[PDB]
Amino acid sequence: PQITLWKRPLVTIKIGGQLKEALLDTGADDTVLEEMSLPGRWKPKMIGGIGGFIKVRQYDQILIEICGHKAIGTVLVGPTPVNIIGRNLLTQIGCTLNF
Residues lying near ligand A83 in the complex (CB under 6 A): 25, 27-30, 32, 47-50, 80-82, 84, 86
The reply to whether 25 belongs to the active site is yes
Element (H, E) at 90: helix 87-90
What binding mask, one character per residue, do residues 17-46 give for its own copies by CB under 8 A, x or -?
Answer: ------xxxxxxx--x--------------
Question: Which lies closer to ligand A83 via its Cβ, residue 17 or residue 61?
Answer: 61
Structural contact between residues 75 and 59, judged by C-beta atoms closer than 8 angstroms: yes
How far, in Å, CA of 77 to CA of 46, rounded? 10
Active site residues: 25
